[PDB]
């Protein structure tokens, strides 16, 4: 299990959390020096538990599928909550079995459904360490509309930061002040599956992508990533989604 405390949190302690999160995900192989997540893991070993503590010291435990870094559900006091999707239902067979009750959220965990439930796109939801503290607080007490927004914050500040160093750094910049995600941040999130695939295909193709991946740079301009020498590959992406899961 991996842990993060918002009480006394700073950029360094957050960086240590994201390092721990990445380090927990199992892999046998690296592709261009980037850990390749496993095709599958059977049983309870599929799920990583993250213990998160808000500034007041209250906690949730979040279940993460170690093959795809997807959040499946979370435990808050004696109640578990899982996304309304088959992978989460399966997870609920293995984690938080001790919960007194299990609530299925009224949405799946994909960004599109969460944004609909929340009433707002990610572009307009501030992220940062204060926002993460707030998200943990929200998730302690069931409100499905508020939780959707909280879960968009939680997913970006854990999973997406684990996937991309750039996103980790963006959250570190927002240690004491929230700010809506940069356009480049959104682009990277949206491209993780595509990049993961092309980096794997590039082995066998001299490091050249079969199909370019289009991103937005931090300044605002659209760029094409065509091969493994790109900074996105050498110095940003930290985890690859297995092509078996794409
Ligand atoms: N269940 C779940 N879906 C997620 C999570 N984080 C991001 N998503 C996103 O929702 C988008 C579409 O995912 P898909 O529904 O195609 O698997 C992707 O960006 C995917 O990564 C998460 O933590 N849990
Ligand atoms: C490889 O990527 C680099 C960095 O963007 C670029 O300058 C170069 O043109 C690319 N080469 C090929 C063959 O795609």
């Amino acid at each position: 299990d991996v842990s993060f405390r918002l009480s006394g949190a700073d950029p360094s302690s957050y960086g240590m959390f994201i390092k721990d999160l990445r380090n927990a995900l199992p892999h046998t192989e690296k592709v261009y020096n980037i850990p390749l997540l496993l095709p599958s893991v059977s049983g309870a070993g599929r799920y990583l538990l993250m213990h998160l503590f808000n500034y007041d010291g209250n906690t949730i435990t979040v279940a993460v599928d170690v093959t795809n870094v997807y959040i499946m559900g979370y435990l808050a006091l004696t109640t578990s909550y899982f996304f309304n999707e088959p992978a989460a239902d399966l997870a609920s067979q293995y984690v938080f079995r001790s919960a007194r009750r299990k609530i299925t959220l009224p949405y799946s965990g994909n960004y599109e459904r969460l944004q609909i439930a929340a009433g707002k796109p990610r572009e307009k939801i501030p992220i940062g360490l204060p926002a993460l503290d707030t998200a943990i607080s929200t998730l302690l007490h069931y409100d499905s509309t508020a939780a959707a927004g909280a879960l968009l914050v939680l997913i970006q500040t854990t999973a997406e930061a684990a996937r991309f160093k750039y996103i980790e750094q963006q959250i570190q910049e927002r240690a004491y002040r929230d700010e809506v995600p940069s356009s480049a941040t959104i682009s990277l999130e949206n491209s993780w599956s595509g990049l993961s695939k092309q980096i794997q295909l590039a082995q066998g193709n001299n490091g050249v992508f079969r199909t370019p991946t289009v991103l937005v740079d931090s300044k605002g301009n659209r760029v094409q990533i065509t091969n493994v020498t790109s900074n996105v590959v050498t110095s940003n992406i930290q985890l690859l989604l297995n092509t078996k899961n794409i």
Side-chain angles (χ1 to χ4, degrees):
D1 298 10
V2 302
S3 286
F4 184 50
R5 291 161 169 87
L6 276 287
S7 189
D10 69 358
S12 168
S13 70
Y14 176 74
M16 290 180 290
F17 160 63
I18 292 300
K19 173 203 299 164
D20 295 343
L21 173 53
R22 286 176 184 140
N23 278 159
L25 307 164
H27 64 276
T28 36
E29 189 178 349
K30 301 191 186 179
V31 172
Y32 292 109
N33 207 38
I34 304 152
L36 177 62
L37 299 170
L38 297 175
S40 58
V41 181
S42 54
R46 193 180 182 93
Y47 309 107
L48 166 63
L49 312 176
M50 312 197 276
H51 310 294
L52 304 174
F53 300 78
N54 76 1
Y55 177 81
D56 292 331
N58 293 324
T59 188
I60 64 170
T61 303
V62 179
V64 174
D65 182 323
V66 305
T67 71
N68 57 13
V69 205
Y70 276 35
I71 294 180
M72 293 294 94
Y74 57 92
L75 178 68
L77 187 40
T78 58
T79 302
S80 67
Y81 301 84
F82 291 91
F83 285 117
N84 192 201
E85 63 180 88
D89 193 50
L90 174 62
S92 75
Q93 303 187 33
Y94 297 89
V95 298
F96 314 143
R97 300 286 305 288
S98 45
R100 293 190 66 234
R101 57 167 188 175
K102 179 178 86 178
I103 293 172
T104 305
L105 296 166
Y107 34 75
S108 76
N110 72 87
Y111 279 144
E112 169 217 3
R113 298 296 180 183
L114 281 172
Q115 287 174 170
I116 295 178
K120 43 173 61 167
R122 292 168 274 156
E123 282 82 354
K124 296 196 220 298
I125 298 167
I127 66 181
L129 295 181
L132 176 55
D133 180 42
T134 299
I136 294 161
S137 300
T138 289
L139 293 171
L140 288 167
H141 286 108
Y142 182 59
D143 166 346
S144 55
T145 296
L151 288 162
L152 288 167
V153 172
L154 173 69
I155 291 160
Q156 297 176 274
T157 58
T158 63
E160 299 290 16
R163 293 169 181 149
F164 296 100
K165 192 172 286 198
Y166 173 85
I167 299 185
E168 182 188 6
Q169 289 170 333
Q170 289 293 106
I171 302 308
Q172 292 170 310
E173 290 177 11
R174 294 155 169 70
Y176 313 118
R177 179 176 67 176
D178 298 326
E179 183 185 332
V180 293
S182 75
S183 299
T185 288
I186 300 290
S187 176
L188 289 170
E189 297 169 358
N190 286 342
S191 301
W192 182 59
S193 190
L195 286 168
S196 289
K197 180 174 185 170
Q198 293 306 319
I199 295 164
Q200 284 162 86
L201 296 170
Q203 173 43 202
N205 188 227
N206 294 308
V208 177
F209 287 9
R210 296 293 178 171
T211 304
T213 293
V214 184
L215 295 180
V216 177
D217 66 35
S218 32
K219 184 78 191 268
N221 310 118
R222 164 229 162 245
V223 300
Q224 290 216 321
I225 315 302
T226 64
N227 67 79
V228 293
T229 71
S230 163
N231 272 351
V232 185
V233 179
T234 62
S235 327
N236 189 352
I237 192 162
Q238 303 292 313
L239 306 168
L240 305 171
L241 185 56
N242 203 291
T243 50
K244 290 191 193 179
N245 299 312
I246 302 172

